[PDB]
Amino acid sequence: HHWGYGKHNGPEHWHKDFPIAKGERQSPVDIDTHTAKYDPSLKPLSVSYDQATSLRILNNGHAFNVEFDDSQDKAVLKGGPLDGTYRLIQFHFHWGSLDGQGSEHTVDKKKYAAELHLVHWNTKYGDFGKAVQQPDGLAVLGIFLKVGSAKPGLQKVVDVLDSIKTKGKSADFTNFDPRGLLPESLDYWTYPGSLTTPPLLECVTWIVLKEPISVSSEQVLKFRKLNFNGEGEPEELMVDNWRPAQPLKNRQIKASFK
Ligand SMILES: Cc1cc(=O)[nH]c(SCC(=O)c2ccc(S(N)(=O)=O)c(Cl)c2)n1
Ligand SMILES: [Zn+2]
């Protein structure tokens, strides 16, 4: 009876195994755009993904992860609100059963169809598993997806999903360029938070881009053909793998713009 996204093991249950679920800096949150503080001293975000080395794509039973070689400074995030260099380790998405929901962060209570998370770890801690035990260990770049025109840079991911339909499947996934998933503008909101899945550790500097990317209805439909179950088990479609907004508590969301 481990955690997941159903009636009996979904987000409202997680606090029984992971008490930090009711902690002081949990994510996601609703981003109230009117009360976000413009911080004229936040720097432009630096996204250096030219040398990125994707390796594999994996269905972990909660989402799919596209994994990167993080054993050197190839694909790094820095600047923005960050005081350190953070290496890309993986990205993944959260999405809905319907276009009207799917994102984890919300903007003035608006849900997007999905949300991309590019997970990076602070190089001062040497690897991901040590970084998540630190309050400044991770930087997650969050990007909203709306349904409209296709995202051509997404299509290589969508086309491999049928090879990783069920939990524990993986596939070689080399030479994927994550620059093809970024919107034009790097304007962002930022606040201190957590992983949005168990173990819900409070180790994340969130950086959420204001500009969503567009994906087509057919691209997101393909995400909804994945399965939470393993091969040979009863089919449970991988939809609605998002945690709802959590109390902001004693936190201020900062904006890099306007
Ligand atoms: C904290 C931890 C330690 C570990 O050894 N393995 C894992 S697997 C979960 C994981 O890496 C992860 C999942 C979701 C997120 S999210 N939705 O971007 O906040 C992150 Cl940052 C990380 N997590
Ligand atoms: Zn995530």
CATH of the domain at 132: 3.10.200.10
C-alpha triplet 157, 64, 126: angle, nearest 5°? 105
Residue of 27, 147, 156, 51 lying closest to 98 (CA atoms)? 147
Yes or no: say if 192 and 85 are a contact pair by the CB < 8 Å rule. Answer: no
Q: Where are the beta strands (DSSP E) in 153-252?
A: 170-172, 188-193, 204-209, 213-215
Name the domain count of the chain. 1
Taking the CA atoms of residue 222, residue 223, residue 227 and residue 228 in that order, the dihedral angle to the nearest 10 degrees is -170
Catalytic residue among 1, 8, 34, 62: 62
Report residue 145 as tokens. 């997806």
CA of 119 to the centre of ligand 2 (A): 8
Q: What's the rounded Cα separation, in Å, for the pair 167 and 61?
A: 4
Return the residue whose CA atom lies nearest to atom 23 of ligand 1: 199
Determine if ligand 1 sits within 6 Å of the CB of residue 230: no
Report residue 158 as tokens. 């969508």
Residue of 73, 193, 94, 188 lying closest to 137 (CA atoms)? 193
Residues within 5 A (CB) of ion ligand 2: 117
Determine if ligand 1 sits within 6 Å of the CB of residue 23: no
Q: Where are the beta strands (DSSP E) in the chain?
A: 30-31, 37-38, 45-48, 54-59, 64-68, 76-79, 86-95, 106-107, 114-122, 138-147, 170-172, 188-193, 204-209, 213-215, 254-255
Upstream peptide bond of 11 is cis (omega within 30 degrees of 0): no
- Residue 62 falls in the annotated catalytic set: yes
**Cα dist. 112→4, 139, 147 in Å?**
21, 21, 9
71 bridge partner residues:
none
Which residues form the domain of 38? 1-258
Q: What's the rounded Cα separation, in Å, for the pair 140 and 162?
A: 27
CA atoms within 13 A on the CB side of 94: 26
CA of 37 to the centre of ligand 2 (A): 24
Sign of CA dihedral 44, 248, 109, 242: positive
Q: What's the rounded Cα separation, in Å, for the pair 240 and 242?
A: 5
37 bridge partner residues:
254
Report residue 92 as tokens. 């993944």
Determine if ligand 1 sits within 6 Å of the CB of residue 195: yes
Report residue 40 as tokens. 């004229």
Q: How was this structure determined?
A: X-ray
Yes or no: say if 25 and 246 are a contact pair by the CB < 8 Å rule. Answer: no
Q: In sequence order, what are the residues at sequence separation of 6 or more whose Cβ sits closer than 8 angstroms to the Cβ of residue 129?
A: none
Yes or no: say if 214 and 149 are a contact pair by the CB < 8 Å rule. Answer: yes
Resolution (A): 1.5
95 bridge partner residues:
114
Report residue 71 as tokens. 């054993």
Report residue 242 as tokens. 């998002």
Q: In sequence order, what are the residues at sequence separation of 6 or more whose Cβ sits closer than 8 angstroms to the Cβ of residue 77?
A: 45, 46, 47, 48, 85, 86, 87, 88, 118, 120, 139, 141, 207
Determine if ligand 1 sits within 6 Å of the CB of residue 89: no
Upstream peptide bond of 28 is cis (omega within 30 degrees of 0): yes
